[PDB]
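User: Predict structure, ligand S-adenosylmethionine.
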Amino acid sequence: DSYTHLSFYEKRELFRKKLREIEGPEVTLVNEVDDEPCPSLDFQFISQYRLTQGVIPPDPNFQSGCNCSGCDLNNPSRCECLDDLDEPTHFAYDAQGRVRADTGAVIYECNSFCSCSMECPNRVVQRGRTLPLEIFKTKEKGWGVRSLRFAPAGTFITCYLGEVITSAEAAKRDKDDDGITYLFDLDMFDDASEYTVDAQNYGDVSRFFNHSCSPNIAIYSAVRNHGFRTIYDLAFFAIKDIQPLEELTFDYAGARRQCKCGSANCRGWLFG
Amino acid sequence: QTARLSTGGCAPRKQ
Ligand SMILES: C[S@@+](CC[C@H](N)C(=O)[O-])C[C@H]1O[C@@H](n2cnc3c(N)ncnc32)[C@H](O)[C@@H]1O
Ligand SMILES: [Zn+2]
Ligand SMILES: [Zn+2]
Ligand SMILES: [Zn+2]
Ligand SMILES: [Zn+2]
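Assistant: Predicted complex:
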């Protein structure tokens, strides 16, 4: 540990001040379990993807918007952002701003080219986190995140951010090794599965989400670009009613040694 | 395939 001249107090205070700099609902850090002061002080919180070399970004000349004069939820036919969806065409969100039960794994939101305001109903992911979260130390896993408010099914939590890297860099970082990884493959679309999100040095609070074989949140691919399927938002949505102080977990598979989730249907392997 | 987190693909079962 290169931070050995800092005290448990100052390191925790420094990480706390790092949390306070995050824009949006507050994020808190508690540790009533062991003596570790905080996660890595070198970690940087970000609000958007951290592209690296070799990662081709979407071309703005291929981008299209909708002509919705924001969009109307009771008339999804007029909006052109939902053309990739089969009939019955509908937005991914209901009147309460939550993802619908019948919505698939791909969410088509509006973008900066639409004639839309920032409070369009199809910009839930873009507006960002609304739930105050708390980072805490768990029993047998590392750090974890729990919600401080009730999160009914369909509530948007946050996105999995970090560096976007190529397959060669992902293998080069596939490994130090201690059973801890922050790599998240962008593999929602098999026709273009090339990049990986690395939350080691840059990332979101979702970087502390743990795995569970009976998860309460799940990933949705929030796509605001045209046909670009190599980079998209990894949006976490609650698939179960999450009560306050309940740990937020998702299936790393997507549906170190053994899994400590403690579910009655634990497969025993994280596979990630 | 990998020791990496996956989205599970877009095969529908209602995420
Ligand atoms: C994204 S980090 C989550 C933990 C936290 N971000 C940290 O660094 O302490 C993923 C790592 O946490 C561990 N982990 C996540 N879920 C686990 C589980 N259900 N049981 C045991 N270990 C788990 C795995 O070793 C994995 O490499
Ligand atoms: Zn719109
Ligand atoms: Zn529209
Ligand atoms: Zn639009
Ligand atoms: Zn398990």
